[PDB]
Amino acid sequence: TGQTPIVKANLYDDYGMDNFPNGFNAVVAVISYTGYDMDDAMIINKSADERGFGYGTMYKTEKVDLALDPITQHFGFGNDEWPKEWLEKLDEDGLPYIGTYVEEGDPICAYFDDTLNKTKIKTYHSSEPAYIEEVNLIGDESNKFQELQTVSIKYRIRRTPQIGDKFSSRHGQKGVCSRKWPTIDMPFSETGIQPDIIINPHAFPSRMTIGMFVESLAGKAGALHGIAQDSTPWIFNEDDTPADYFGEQLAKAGYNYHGNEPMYSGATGEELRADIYVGVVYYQRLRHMIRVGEMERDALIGHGTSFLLQ
Amino acid sequence: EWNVEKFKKDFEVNISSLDAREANFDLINIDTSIANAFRRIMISEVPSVAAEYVYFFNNTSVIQDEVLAHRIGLVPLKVDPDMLTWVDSNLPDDEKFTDENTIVLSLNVKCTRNPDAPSTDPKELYNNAHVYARDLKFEPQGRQSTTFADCPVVPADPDILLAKLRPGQEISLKAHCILGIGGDHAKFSPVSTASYRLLPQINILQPIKGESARRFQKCFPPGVIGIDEGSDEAYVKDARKDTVSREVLRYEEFADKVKLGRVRNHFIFNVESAGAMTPEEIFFKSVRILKNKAEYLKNCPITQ
Amino acid sequence: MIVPVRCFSCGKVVGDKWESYLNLLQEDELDEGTALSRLGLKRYCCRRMILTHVDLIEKFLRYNPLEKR
């Protein structure tokens, strides 16, 4: 689910970056509420994740070549010899059915080599289970003597946002998913909206990412009025402040000038102490998911703990 | 001293607008703990029906099986519950799905080519190119295929796009729609937005008559501040219409001459339905759930 | 890809309002804002859903391995 940024530099269109979306526009509240978000950890909404927010897939391709000049290994199944329930994953040709679910140990292809006179299989092995997306048979590097020996198999590995996955705004504010907080337990706005992503306020005083702060009230203004805003550097001045510019836009729409929103607690249900800073920020999902050495020996000597060392 | 009969004396309800989908009602002289409880139940407890097990036979479309299955689950079905019993998860699939526990919806679409003069429209260039929610054919099975005779299973919104196809591609599936609650998956939500807003209070400390009254009137939405004349003070006509923007407080001439608060007892509820139940039915069931929750604990043995 | 079913934030069905939105921009020649209002999208969350939709599916469909040329 790729999305076009509301807040963007006009050069985004000049490079036609809409052909390749890199993120999604999310309701982000600068709040310390859950207690699981702090400095390098951020919260993702459960009901948002359940609705396909930030969902991704990962494709992996494998080349099954039979080369290791006389042809010995042949794609398919050998007669008389056939180990139990292999036909569940592979078709008559020995190649797998495109769409089939595979786990580590399952057969990914089948062949027969005359040297051993036995029907063998190339096993699929990875901690992550997959589905077959594409199977391509390639019989090249021959003029008239044609026979298949090379096959390319593409695996589709579904990747839902897991606790640990990194997420970041376009202002260098990356954080790992600390928890997928339920919407009932999530803080709810006066409007009735609960944030998709929760960023902790203690992130901003050290990083000084004020671009994100103005992005929050710009994204909100553009979502309401339905107009994209220019966030190209040096467009604004000391006299012509963006906080005043989008602040006027937020007031005109019917919201708080300083980008705040009166929010209520999901647990107690009571209105929170002060208005929470909420807006629309373009978020990006990052792709990433024993030796006892001399120093550990030294540490075990250190405690005077001779049996732990032993 | 608070009595349950003394609550009946002060408790009031005011219905502003009651549409077929959304109802705007007020709960006067009730506690926050009770008003918040109803809102929480009218978004979690309230269950519904919808696809759950999509059985694919063929899918040559661009849209992956997982994605297409998930989209069918998200499509709300104009099916009244209570007609269905709750499915049991421990017994196997052959005993699990019955005519009382499951509703079957089939989708069988094959795309072909059509001769037309050529930008050209997809409805003109190809046949069965766009797959809609209305293409989910209801198949009644078993003991009861007469109970849904005067009640055919049709999606609440039929024009929902489910898939886009090109000639040669086909979709063949059998979806098993079951009974579930919104806490498990959002695809079971019955109401769109159930929220309350406290009645805004504008405590005018000074008369602030004259041209400052016209300046004070512009700080609030049009139908909030009313002025009698140049004098006769500046009154609050309809404090309910207020957006609570605090615009009046960001002016030196009014920052100390007015106070902005609320009526803690007064709640302005706004309940919109997804389409299955009426907004009143959703609120009534919420009160019935809170009563049943307290009743279940009443007739219960206090162990240890 | 295609128009999402329901608004990510609240859950208001948005999937039936994509083709209708383009008709309000083409034939009716209205502005982006007024078009969304006539569709029944007043919350800014529901507003951005359709307004900000790309619809890459129309670009994706132009590659069809089942029909010649």
Binding site: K252 | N24, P222, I268 | -
Partner: peptide, 24 residues
């Protein structure tokens, strides 16, 4: 340096629960 130019047409578009855009 020339200052940016303001926009045009910016009316209200948020009211109470049971109140529409009837008030102009």
């Amino acid at each position: 340096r020339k200052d940016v130019p303001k926009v045009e047409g910016l009316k209200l578009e948020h009211f109470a629960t049971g109140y529409d855009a009837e008030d102009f």
